[PDB]
Design a protein around this ligand. Structure first.
Ligand SMILES: CCCCCCCCCCCCCC(=O)SCCNC(=O)CCNC(=O)[C@H](O)C(C)(C)COP(=O)(O)OP(=O)(O)OC[C@H]1O[C@@H](n2cnc3c(N)ncnc32)[C@H](O)[C@@H]1OP(=O)(O)O
Ligand SMILES: NCCCC[C@H](NC(=O)[C@H](CO)NC(=O)CCCCCCCCCO)C(=O)NCCC1CCCCC1
Ligand SMILES: [Mg+2]
Length: 411
């Protein structure tokens, strides 16, 4: 079945994943000094390249590769169009390792053919709550607790092979070279996500979509006028009315996040995320980086009561190219990012996210059913789409968990 993934330290089947009762590594313990110091062999017409990520042409080259060759929906109607500013943000968090950004170029002309990115993340990835209970029952609490400490690992994103090089076994070479560069820095696990099923996810959830500009979504066939609307004399205007939103936020204490909010947002986010089995731990510099507003990229608002931050929400922007429509080239999507509510119901916090996104010209708001996102689906009129996001670890056995026990938002 899997000539590459059968050779890797990952659970090989659902049945095997069903058998896992404790968190912990899969592979032989190794040491840095055992890992090759030379780059993995590659054919003589290609070369490895480490882009500099904060330098504009290098970001542009990766931008072009992903604009033309990154993920599409299953019908090849939309392709992500991550911006250059978004990629500089996502790939350069505090203390990022430049060497974990890996590219293949054609040696002759320096054409970018393939890319993968790794960034640091500190992740809680110890045995989950339901499995710690069974451990107590059986007198196995010490082994269930062994890997409780948050670990400094690699978060992978943006794997892409140019369309002309597909199914030539180039993705395994890129994945082995990234693994080598991460292991040479004494890091032995990774976390990654994909829309496709690979061996073997520890969690899976559907995507949900909240229509903000239904007339455009219908015109570009992102959504339709649903068959039920045919009972109406005028199906589209009913649909506009259905999804209409206030022109201004309803929580009076809401404002954009500023730098002096960082310690309070860190505190309330960290305390909220402790309720999930798998989630990130962020320093003040990582809260600053991932949450302070950046135009066109990330948008963050706080609710301030009596000069204290009591709630906040964030969303990020990823446009998609619309492949072939005569009226529109781009789908402007907002994605639910981190949030925490302590003074109001979550639905009432996230209604203001929808309000602000619509005010700023977003067409749809998207999310996976991680965090407590299911708690506001029905009242805020999100509907399930056709895709899923699957969560995976490299070199980590982990019991299957529900997606509502996952607190890591992937960009
Ligand atoms: C400790 C540090 C560890 C660091 C690394 C941790 C692991 C990170 C792992 C990567 C996480 C990435 C997270 C994301 O970014 S998920 C998004 C991935 N990108 C896209 O979908 C963009 C469009 N497609 C492509 O660019 C190509 O189709 C890709 C690059 C996906 C595959 O190229 P191609 O189609 O030309 O195929 P090949 O002949 O070269 O290679 C075939 C082999 O590739 C296996 N395959 C197919 N799709 C994926 C996939 N999404 N993750 C992992 N493996 C995948 C496949 O099962 C087969 O192996 P096996 O079935 O024969 O065994
Ligand atoms: N195939 C035809 C177009 C479907 C468009 C949309 N689907 C997605 O965007 C899907 C997600 O659903 N996207 C994809 O499948 C592509 C991405 C999948 C994940 C890739 C992640 C890579 C991660 C790297 O770390 C969708 O279903 N829209 C329906 C909206 C509707 C609004 C009214 C209420 C009901 C819903
Ligand atoms: Mg290939």
């Amino acid at each position: 079945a899997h000539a590459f993934w059968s050779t890797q330290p990952v659970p090989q089947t659902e049945d095997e994943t069903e058998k896992i009762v404790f968190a912990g590594p899969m592979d032989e313990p190794k040491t840095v000094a055992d890992i090759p110091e030379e780059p993995y062999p590659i054919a003589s017409t290609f070369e490895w390249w480490t882009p500099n990520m904060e330098a504009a042409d290098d970001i542009h080259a990766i931008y072009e590769l992903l604009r033309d060759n990154y993920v599409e929906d299953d019908d090849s109607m939309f392709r992500f169009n991550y911006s250059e500013e978004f990629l500089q943000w996502a790939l350069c968090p505090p203390n990022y390792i430049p060497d974990w950004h890996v590219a293949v170029r054609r040696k002759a002309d320096k054409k970018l053919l393939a890319f993968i990115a790794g960034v640091p993340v500190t992740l809680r990835m110890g045995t989950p709550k339901y499995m710690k209970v069974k451990a107590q029952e059986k007198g196995e609490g010490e082994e269930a607790a062994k890997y409780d400490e948050p670990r400094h690992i690699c978060e992978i994103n943006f794997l892409c092979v140019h369309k002309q090089l597909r199914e030539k076994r180039l993705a395994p070479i890129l994945i082995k070279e990234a693994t080598r560069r991460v292991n040479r820095t004494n890091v032995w696990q990774a976390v990654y996500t994909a829309g496709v099923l690979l061996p073997t996810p520890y969690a899976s959830g559907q995507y949900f979509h909240r229509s903000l500009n239904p007339e455009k979504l219908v015109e570009i066939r992102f959504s339709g006028i649903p068959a039920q609307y045919q009972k109406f004399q005028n199906p589209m205007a009913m649909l506009k009315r259905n999804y209409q939103l206030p022109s201004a936020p309803k929580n009076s204490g809401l404002r954009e996040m500023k730098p002096s909010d960082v310690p309070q947002v860190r505190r309330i986010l960290m305390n909220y995320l402790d309720s999930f089995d798998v989630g990130p731990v962020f320093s003040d510099a990582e809260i600053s980086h991932y949450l302070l507003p950046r135009d066109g990229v990330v948008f963050t608002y706080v609710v301030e009561n009596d000069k204290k931050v009591t709630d906040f929400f964030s969303f990020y922007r990823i446009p998609s190219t619309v492949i072939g429509n005569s009226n529109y080239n781009l789908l402007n999507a907002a994605y639910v990012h981190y949030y925490a509510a302590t003074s109001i119901p979550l639905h009432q916090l996230i209604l203001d996210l929808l309000i602000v996104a619509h005010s700023r010209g977003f067409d749809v708001c998207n999310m996976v059913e991680i965090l407590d996102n299911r708690s506001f689906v029905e009242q805020l009129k999100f509907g399930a789409g056709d895709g899923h996001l699957r969560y995976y670890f490299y070199n980590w056995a982990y019991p299957k968990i529900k997606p509502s026990q996952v607190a890591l938002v992937m960009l």
